[PDB]
Amino acid sequence: GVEIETISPGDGRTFPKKGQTCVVHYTGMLQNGKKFDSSRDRNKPFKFRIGKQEVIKGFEEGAAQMSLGQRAKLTCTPDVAYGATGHPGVIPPNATLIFDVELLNLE
C-alpha cells in the first residue's frame, strides 16, 4: 500500500519509466519517531534507476506514481520493507515508514 500525499507544484507528466536513472530528494521519517535517513544531509540526492528492485517496494511504487517537480509524502507499509525482518539498529520489525519525497529527476 502506497498512499501519496503530494505537495502541489510540478508538471504532472514527466513520469519515470524503466531503466531511467532518477533523482529524489528523499527524507525519511519514523511514525511517532525521529528521522533515520535523509538525502539533504549527504547532499547527494540518490541517483537511482527504476526497475531493478534496488529501493524498497514502498519507495519504488511511489516513484513511478510521481512526476517531475512533484513533492509527495510516502506512507510505507511494514510488510513491503522491514515489517517481519526489521533492520538491526535502524528500522524495527512492524514499522510504518514515512518519507518526504520530491521527484526532481533526470533522464
Numbering used by the authors: 1 to 107
According to the publication:
RyRs are calcium-activated calcium channels critical to excitation/contraction coupling in heart and skeletal muscle. Ca2+, ATP, and caffeine are well-characterized activators of RyR, synergistically activating the channel by inducing a rotation of its activation core and pore opening.
The rapid decrease in conformational energy and binding affinity between states 2 and 3 implies minimal protein conformational changes during the Ca2+ association. Information from at least six structures along the functional route on the energy landscapes was needed to identify a thermally accessible pathway by MD-based piecewise free-energy simulations (see “Methods”).
